Amino acid sequence: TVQCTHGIRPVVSTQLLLNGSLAEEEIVIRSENITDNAKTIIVQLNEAVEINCTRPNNNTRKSIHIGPGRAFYATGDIIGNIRQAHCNISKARWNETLGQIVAKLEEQFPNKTIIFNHSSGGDPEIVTHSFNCGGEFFYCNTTPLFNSTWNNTGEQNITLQCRIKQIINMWQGVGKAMYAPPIRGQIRCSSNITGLLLTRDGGRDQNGTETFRPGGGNMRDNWRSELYKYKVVKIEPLGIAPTACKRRV
Amino acid sequence: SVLTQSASVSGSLGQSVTISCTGPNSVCCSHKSISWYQWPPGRAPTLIIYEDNERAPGISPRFSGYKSYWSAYLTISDLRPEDETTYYCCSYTHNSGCVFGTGTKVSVLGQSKANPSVTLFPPSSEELQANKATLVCLISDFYPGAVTVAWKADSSPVKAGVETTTPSKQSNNKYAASSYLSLTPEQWKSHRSYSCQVTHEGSTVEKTVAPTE
Amino acid sequence: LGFLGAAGSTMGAASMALTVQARLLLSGIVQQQNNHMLQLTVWGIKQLQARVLAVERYLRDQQLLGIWGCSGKIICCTNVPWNDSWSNKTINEIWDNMTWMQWEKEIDNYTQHIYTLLEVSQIQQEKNEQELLELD
Amino acid sequence: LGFLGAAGSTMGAASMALTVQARLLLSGIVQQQNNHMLQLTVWGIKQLQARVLAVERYLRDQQLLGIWGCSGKIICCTNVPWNDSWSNKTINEIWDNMTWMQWEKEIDNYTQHIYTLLEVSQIQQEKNEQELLELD
Amino acid sequence: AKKWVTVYYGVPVWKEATTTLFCASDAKAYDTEVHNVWATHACVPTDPNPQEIVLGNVTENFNMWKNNMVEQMHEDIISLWDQSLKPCVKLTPLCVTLNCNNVNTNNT
Amino acid sequence: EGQLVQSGAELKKPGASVKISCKTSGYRFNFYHINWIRQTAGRGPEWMGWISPYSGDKNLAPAFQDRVIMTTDTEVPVTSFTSTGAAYMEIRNLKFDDTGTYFCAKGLLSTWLPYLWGQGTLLTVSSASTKGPSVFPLAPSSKSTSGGTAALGCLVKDYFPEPVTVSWNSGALTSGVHTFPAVLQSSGLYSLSSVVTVPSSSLGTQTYICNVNHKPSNTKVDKRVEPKSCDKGLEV
Ligand SMILES: *[C@@H]1O[C@H](CO)[C@@H](O[C@@H]2O[C@H](CO)[C@@H](O[C@@H]3O[C@H](CO[C@H]4O[C@H](CO[C@H]5O[C@H](CO)[C@@H](O)[C@H](O)[C@@H]5O)[C@@H](O)[C@H](O)[C@@H]4O)[C@@H](O)[C@H](O[C@H]4O[C@H](CO)[C@@H](O)[C@H](O)[C@@H]4O)[C@@H]3O)[C@H](O)[C@H]2NC(C)=O)[C@H](O)[C@H]1NC(C)=O
Ligand SMILES: *[C@@H]1O[C@H](CO)[C@@H](O[C@@H]2O[C@H](CO)[C@@H](O[C@@H]3O[C@H](CO)[C@@H](O)[C@H](O[C@H]4O[C@H](CO)[C@@H](O)[C@H](O)[C@@H]4O)[C@@H]3O)[C@H](O)[C@H]2NC(C)=O)[C@H](O)[C@H]1NC(C)=O
Ligand SMILES: *[C@@H]1O[C@H](CO)[C@@H](O[C@@H]2O[C@H](CO)[C@@H](O[C@@H]3O[C@H](CO)[C@@H](O)[C@H](O)[C@@H]3O)[C@H](O)[C@H]2NC(C)=O)[C@H](O)[C@H]1NC(C)=O
Ligand SMILES: *[C@@H]1O[C@H](CO)[C@@H](O[C@@H]2O[C@H](CO)[C@@H](O[C@@H]3O[C@H](CO)[C@@H](O)[C@H](O)[C@@H]3O)[C@H](O)[C@H]2NC(C)=O)[C@H](O)[C@H]1NC(C)=O
Ligand SMILES: *[C@@H]1O[C@H](CO)[C@@H](O[C@@H]2O[C@H](CO)[C@@H](O[C@@H]3O[C@H](CO)[C@@H](O)[C@H](O)[C@@H]3O)[C@H](O)[C@H]2NC(C)=O)[C@H](O)[C@H]1NC(C)=O
Ligand SMILES: *[C@@H]1O[C@H](CO)[C@@H](O[C@@H]2O[C@H](CO)[C@@H](O[C@@H]3O[C@H](CO)[C@@H](O)[C@H](O)[C@@H]3O)[C@H](O)[C@H]2NC(C)=O)[C@H](O)[C@H]1NC(C)=O
Ligand SMILES: *[C@@H]1O[C@H](CO)[C@@H](O[C@@H]2O[C@H](CO)[C@@H](O[C@@H]3O[C@H](CO)[C@@H](O)[C@H](O)[C@@H]3O)[C@H](O)[C@H]2NC(C)=O)[C@H](O)[C@H]1NC(C)=O
Ligand SMILES: *[C@@H]1O[C@H](CO)[C@@H](O[C@@H]2O[C@H](CO)[C@@H](O[C@@H]3O[C@H](CO)[C@@H](O)[C@H](O)[C@@H]3O)[C@H](O)[C@H]2NC(C)=O)[C@H](O)[C@H]1NC(C)=O
Ligand SMILES: *[C@@H]1O[C@H](CO)[C@@H](O[C@@H]2O[C@H](CO)[C@@H](O[C@@H]3O[C@H](CO)[C@@H](O)[C@H](O)[C@@H]3O)[C@H](O)[C@H]2NC(C)=O)[C@H](O)[C@H]1NC(C)=O
Ligand SMILES: *[C@@H]1O[C@H](CO)[C@@H](O[C@@H]2O[C@H](CO)[C@@H](O)[C@H](O)[C@H]2NC(C)=O)[C@H](O)[C@H]1NC(C)=O
Ligand SMILES: *[C@@H]1O[C@H](CO)[C@@H](O)[C@H](O)[C@H]1NC(C)=O
Ligand SMILES: *[C@@H]1O[C@H](CO)[C@@H](O)[C@H](O)[C@H]1NC(C)=O
Ligand SMILES: *[C@@H]1O[C@H](CO)[C@@H](O)[C@H](O)[C@H]1NC(C)=O
Ligand SMILES: *[C@@H]1O[C@H](CO)[C@@H](O)[C@H](O)[C@H]1NC(C)=O
């Protein structure tokens, strides 16, 4: 019984989870729904998988005034060679984390049935690992991950197709749209992997093919790996119980 | 067993009955809380008293308790047919394990002379095929629990073909007993007129079945 | 014994410590300091709306104790007999067995009819008898 | 007997049932569930401002009963004598004739002077005498 | 044996329900960064001593997917996202005609 | 009222280690204590020991200390109150005095005492070998043809050791069936039978098949009531 919850950080990302609860000794499978492939499945990690995120695009400050007073700040000039954002990740550490993911799905789902593929369809923000880092929004690729097909159960250079975007009306803002301002100079990460979001394999009857990929398109499920351990209750202090005693004059 | 019961108590239907349980001055009924149990041998026992005067929830207010300076007792006002069985007492504390009694046998009299559904089974084409000569007798609800088994191999004194059992308490709270015949076809073929004699005060409509037809 | 630190324990041990369950119930670890220059933000609105629901749950039961002569203390008995039809279990039995947890799920039904009867025998009859009995 | 269901009836029959007038006074048929995605609408502001005025009318009189030793019950007498100059009618007479309705319009005037005197004889004198009288 | 009604206050019994919650945050940068989008200038502060009381003999059924706290966090962030940047520069007249070429080098 | 599931028909030779189990269902197994008791052939029930499933507290008799060692597992919650658990009992260096019925009991809250018991586990501590029941069907009874009702059943000749569960058409025919008291013979072997009173005016279009089961000798022998009548009852 707590009156104050865990240090939950408001996660602003799709595909991968950045902060929060890491329940130890096994990877926890959050099941909203599992028998029917169609519904989303969140998975809590046992041990954190550190992820670097940089942007060696060095930009100056350009201010143009729109009418009276109002100041608009945009990307100035890029100093140096033309290059991608560059997130980076480990090769073996991830493989080790995936090791228990494929082993747990053999227990949850039937036998060793065919189960691999990449993010299906979608717009940039939906199918890519869209996340805020240092200010700007990074749109790195989820293709080198699902490249491994396996049945029976400083560091290395692993990166994804990194792309930047400034026009961002996140969670589909049909009223007020937001323009992300560029960040002058240095771009650092000091972030984490605290989980992931998966999807279905259509509506195949029986079979031996049930290829799973990342198709989780919800922001609510992102905090379901944080508020999984919470449930609010109303306290009833008034209680009526009979016993051998009474009042007099 | 140190904690002793009245061993044999007799009562009548619709009448009050009391069982005197007494123990030594070591496991005396003065400081220790006493409990009673309705335990039919073979069946599941039922908790009657859970704390001296207090009865277990669901148990009739007919049952009551009393505790003296060393001995404890149980009073059953208005007796019912389900009551005739062996009872057990218990001495205990909130520090130690249970102490069990010797056991008292209760016979609830007043019941009508229940006529039994007596049946004599002759050996079939399968019983005789396996070279086994047997003749059994069933008895169901025959209150009182008294039994008289008598076999008649051509109405001669039977010595070897005698097999009696213990009359157990039946579902209707009456009695049920068993009678068997263990003989080879050689001693079986020397006698043919097999008469069944069960002595219970009453009529003479006994089922006399021949093993050979 | 801790906030709700007796809920697990049986009714007898729950009635033993029930003051802490009312102590940390209002201004405990939720009150705090309650500290662009404006306080009309999303956190300001959420804290004051929750404050209204906070007193509402206390005052509902606080008014009842006030109209039962039980306002002066945590545990106070009444001059109301228990209709056996409501509950058939022994007084001492639920106190070391059933626990307040399941017990609330048993009374909740006749709880409003119980509150209706608690008002008259202890206050609408007892305190109304005083009008004539006070001076004699 | 119903919310204000004794206002019509004489003081004697009004004092007979006055608990319901305080029961449905707070959380009765006005409390409710209290259930674009925002609650800052015209109905949200109106309900919370009314909630402040709701407790204000209760607490004003609730504080008075608390400082009179009458907090524990609905009806409790005091050690304050009645100055004949305020009202000259017989005790039994207003109870079956005048009714609480007209009676409030009679006292309302000296009501503040009555409240001033009610504080001292019953609490500032009676409860202050206890300091020395409690241990003897 | 003469059963009489006894009133008890402060009974440790709960009923499954959802209410309006609020913030709990510790002092971050304090001097340099004073207001970040979520915490803002005035956030409800947190206590260094939380109620860690564990209830033995309690096997309450938790609802992971049907939790109503999740929906509260969903509405709070978006409403704050719309609020944030409201007093800032509107880029409504900025959107105009756009004519261009590519870089000084052909994609290298 | 809670129902207990007592695992039965387990027994072995003297000196050997006996393992008796019991599954708890439809109640809070955690705060409810567990009591174990046995009864000898001399009608003297010996209280074995008391065990707690929430805390490591135990109270055991001196005659059952080095020989008897008990164990318990964690509760499996079904609802906010109901749970499922199990208790195991290990006895070493057994004698013929240890032969009798062993029972498992559910606790009360003066709490140490029980409240509800199981079915029963008849333990036979004997050095003699196991014998399989000789199932034989019985010919029609010596009753009547008036209406149809007349007795018909089966007979179990010899086996060793009890208990033996016998039903009709695998848990279908339970009413109007009497279980005969199974008692030991001169050779030291148990014997039983079963009698069913069904409306049989003439043998035809009816179920006569039964079910016989055992644990140390696993039995399958099921024989139906004899059509070739050897009695006058099902004639006139
Ligand atoms: C789970 O939640 C945590 C929340 O704590 C997420 O934390 C991430 O942490 C990193 C690493 O710190 C953030 O990036 C930087 O944080 C710096 C902290 O700076 C403080 O001290 C400064 C002293 O300045 C000198 O050192 C800093 C070292 O970075 C140099 O950058 C600087 O040039 C100087 O040499 C103070 O001046 C400063 O204000 C702080 O008190 C920040 O310095 C740095 O911010 C730069 O830009 C800021 C924009 O306002 C500006 O105010 C600063 O002055 C500075 O120039 C930068 O933010 C990550 O941003 C942060 N977030 C994320 C999402 O990664 C954690 O990541 C999160 N996620 C998980 C686990 O997945
Ligand atoms: C996760 O969600 C699933 C939702 O599918 C839920 O399990 C479902 O339960 C229903 C119970 O009615 C199952 O329904 C039947 O399953 C049988 C066996 O395969 C089918 O033969 C049935 O066919 C029906 O529907 C057809 C399509 O319209 C019709 O043509 C036909 O006439 C029948 O009406 C029917 O599908 C359903 O299969 C499951 N889902 C499964 C097994 O995948 C599950 O409980 C949730 N799990 C949790 C708690 O995580
Ligand atoms: C992640 O990648 C690594 C390789 O980079 C895979 O590691 C290797 O996994 C295999 C089989 O799962 C291990 O094989 C075993 O080696 C032991 C060594 O004694 C041997 O006794 C066994 O018979 C078996 O051959 C291997 O040691 C391990 N190490 C290597 C080669 O790097 C890992 O399996 C990948 N992740 C997966 C598929 O889960
Ligand atoms: C997972 O990755 C694999 C990578 O190769 C994709 O495989 C194949 O993709 C092709 C082109 O879309 C599919 O072609 C189609 O074949 C059907 C067969 O009848 C035909 O009718 C269509 O017109 C088209 O030619 C091919 O089936 C597909 N193979 C499969 C089933 O794996 C695969 O599609 C990826 N899965 C997804 C979509 O996530
Ligand atoms: C991402 O997850 C990792 C888990 O490995 C977090 O690592 C831990 O970060 C904390 C600081 O937030 C470290 O604390 C300090 O460690 C130093 C070195 O010994 C010590 O001297 C200080 O007293 C302090 O305890 C902690 O060691 C570190 N754990 C390790 C060894 O990895 C990381 O913080 C997460 N990133 C976040 C919060 O964004
Ligand atoms: C209030 O007390 C009464 C009277 O004792 C309860 O009513 C009925 O009480 C009898 C007690 O003999 C219950 O019979 C029970 O039958 C079960 C199943 O056959 C058996 O295992 C018990 O030993 C007992 O013989 C009967 O079910 C019960 N009737 C009902 C449906 O209420 C009464 O239930 C008590 N309290 C309540 C919940 O109202
Ligand atoms: C009032 O006393 C009753 C007496 O048992 C308590 O339970 C009653 O239980 C029945 C059967 O469970 C309820 O029926 C309900 O049907 C709905 C249909 O959607 C189903 O969702 C429920 O699970 C349940 O089966 C019945 O409503 C319920 N109440 C009454 C008044 O009969 C009940 O807890 C006591 N307390 C309260 C708060 O009324
Ligand atoms: C308090 O009691 C006093 C004294 O009894 C009331 O003062 C005066 O009382 C006399 C009673 O004889 C009133 O005289 C009345 O005159 C009318 C009209 O002529 C007549 O119909 C009555 O039979 C009676 O004789 C007198 O009016 C009254 N004076 C005033 C103006 O107050 C006193 O009014 C009582 N209470 C109050 C309201 O202060
Ligand atoms: C206080 O005691 C008086 C004694 O009668 C109660 O009534 C008083 O009545 C006179 C005459 O009706 C009031 O004069 C007023 O003049 C205004 C001028 O606008 C007119 O609008 C009124 O209709 C009335 O004629 C006088 O104010 C009033 N009060 C006092 C203090 O003399 C009065 O009800 C008692 N209670 C209260 C609340 O003061
Ligand atoms: C981007 O690279 C340029 C190239 O060095 C950095 O430019 C220096 O900026 C400092 C700031 O005062 C000047 O004093 C130096 O003279 C600059 N050097 C030259 C020759 O340009 C710049 O700092 C880098 N990025 C940012 C945004 O800090
Ligand atoms: C990831 O990289 C692959 C290989 O170049 C490319 O085909 C794909 O379009 C990229 N993005 C996604 C969303 O997979
Ligand atoms: C990426 O981050 C890890 C964790 O600090 C670090 O050890 C590694 O050196 C970083 N990458 C580089 C630049 O080598
Ligand atoms: C204790 O409460 C449980 C709740 O179901 C009940 O089943 C049990 O019989 C109760 N024991 C007694 C009689 O106190
Ligand atoms: C009752 O009250 C009315 C109010 O005006 C009054 O006129 C009447 O004289 C009163 N009767 C008595 C004396 O109670």
Residue numbers in the entry:
A (entry chain G): 244 to 309, 312 to 321, 321A, 322 to 358, 360 to 398, 410 to 505
B (entry chain E): 2 to 214
C (entry chain B), D (entry chain B): 520 to 554, 564 to 664
E (entry chain G): 32 to 139
F (entry chain D): 1 to 52, 52A, 53 to 72, 72A, 72B, 72C, 72D, 72E, ...
Question: What do the study's own words say?
Answer:
We solved the structures of BG18-BG505-35O22, BG18-B41-35O22, and BG18-BG505-IOMA complexes to resolutions of 4.1, 4.9, and 6.7 Å, respectively by molecular replacement using synchrotron radiation datasets. The BG18-BG505-35O22, BG18-B41-35O22, and BG18-BG505-IOMA structures each comprised an Env trimer bound to three BG18 Fabs and three 35O22 or IOMA Fabs, with ordered electron density corresponding to native glycans at the Fab interfaces. Modeling of oligomannose N-linked glycans into ordered electron density was also possible in the 4.9 Å BG18-B41-35O22 structure, and for the N332gp120 glycan in the 6.7 Å BG18-BG505-IOMA structure. Overlay of BG505 and B41 Env structures showed conservation of the glycan shield surrounding the BG18 binding site. B41 Env harbors a GNIR sequence instead of GDIR, allowing us to analyze the D325Ngp120 substitution in our BG18-B41-35O22 structure. Side chain placement was not possible due to low resolution (4.9 Å), but the BG18 interaction with B41 resembled its interaction with BG505 in the BG18-BG505-35O22 structure, suggesting that BG18 recognizes the GNIR motif analogously to how it recognizes GDIR. However, while BG18 S53LC potentially engages N325gp120, the loss of BG18 Q54LC contacts resulted in the disorder of CDRL2 residues 54-60 in our BG18-B41 structure. The demonstration that two HIV-1 Env trimers (BG505 and B41) can be crystallized in different crystal packing lattices without converting their glycans to exclusively high-mannose forms provides an impetus for further crystallization efforts using natively glycosylated HIV-1 Envs.
